[PDB]
C-alpha cells in the first residue's frame with residue numbers, strides 16, 4: 400500500500416539515524432534530521448487518511464453501532480502511529496539541546512543513551528504499525 404511505503408521510508412531513515420554514524424551525528428546537530436523525519440511523517444499520515452477514505456467505498460454493510468466502533472478504533476490506531484513518530488522526533492530534538500549544553504565536551508555517553516532509547520521508541524512504532532495494518536485488513540468486513 401502507498402501508506403506502508405511511506406511508513407517504510409520513515410522507518411529506513413530512522414534505521415540510518417539509529418547507527419549514529421559520523422554523518423548522522425553531524426545532521427543531528429542541525430535541523431536536518433528532524434526536518435526530514437517531519438516530512439516523512441507528514442506524508443505517511445496523509446497517505447493513511449486517504450487510504451481509510453478509499454476503504455470506506457468498499458465496506459461490507461454491518462450494524463451501525465459496529466461500524467462506528469471500528470471506525471473510532473481505527474482512528475485511535477492512526478493517532479497512535481502519528482504520536483509514535485512525533486515522540487521519535489521529539490527525542491532527537493532533546494538530544495540536540497543536550498549536546499549544546501555540554502559546551503564542546505565529549506558526547507559519547509549522550510549517544511549511548513540516545514541509541515538505547517531510540518531502540519525502544521522504534522519497537523513501539525513497529526508494534527503500533529503492525530496493529531494498524533491488522534485493523535485495516537479486517538475493517539471492510
Ligand SMILES: CC(C)(O)c1ccc(-c2cc(Cl)cc(C3(C(=N)N)CCC3)c2)cc1
Nearest residue numbers: 403404406407408410411524525528529532
Ligand atoms: C520497502 C521499504 C520502503 O524499505 C519499506 C516498506 C515498509 C516498511 C515497513 C515498516 C514498518 Cl514500521 C511497518 C511496516 C508494516 C509491515 N509490517 N509490513 C506494518 C504495516 C506494513 C512496513 C519498511 C521498509
